[PDB]
């Protein structure tokens, strides 16, 4: 599992790597409960 | 006639000192023996062997 990240600018930079040995299937973005956002 | 190349006069060798060992022998020689169904993986990096 590779993951890049960027704080300033559009091009990203390497952040970390992780080995799991399994195939990822799904992903989900959970909502945020607030009173006072896009993904 | 044929070509020629300038022969080197020295040699540059650069390595990172004071680096720990990979101790791969301790990983292979362990009492806990894995199984071919649930084999694991260990990554050795930034060390000497
Ligand atoms: C052999 O493998 C075992 C794993 O089953 C190693 O035990 C781990 O040791 C590390 C420290 O190096 C601990 O952080 C882990 O919690 C241990 N896992 C356990 C107790 O399940 C062991 O170090 C390896 N080497 C030897 C010589 O036994």
- B→A contacts (Cβ < 8 Å), by residue, are 41, 43
Which among B20, B29, B30 is the best mutation to test ligand 1's pocket, defined by most ligand atoms within 8 Å of the CB?
A: B30
Q: What angle do CA B32, B34, B35 make, to 5 degrees?
A: 145
- Cα B41 to Cα A34, B5, B37, B38, distances in angstroms: 43, 46, 13, 10
Query: What 3-state DSSP class applies to A13?
Result: strand
Query: In terms of CA atoms, which chain B residue is nearest residue A17?
Result: B43
Residues on chain B touching A19 (C-beta within 8 angstroms): 41, 43
Q: DSSP for B1-49?
A: -----PPP---------S--B--HHHHHS-SS---TTS-------S-B-
Q: Nearest chain A residue to B37 by CA: give it.
A: A21
- Per-residue DSSP letter, A21: -
């Amino acid at each position: 599992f590779y993951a890049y990240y960027a704080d300033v600018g559009m091009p990203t930079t390497f952040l970390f790597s992780l080995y799991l040995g399994t195939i990822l299937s799904h992903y989900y973005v959970m909502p945020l409960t607030c009173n006072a956002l896009e993904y | 006639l044929s070509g020629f190349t300038v022969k080197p006069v020295a040699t540059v060798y650069r390595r990172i000192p004071n680096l720990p060992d990979c101790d791969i022998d301790n990983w292979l020689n362990n009492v806990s023996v894995p199984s071919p169904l649930n084999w694991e993986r260990r990554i050795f990096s930034n060390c000497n062997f």
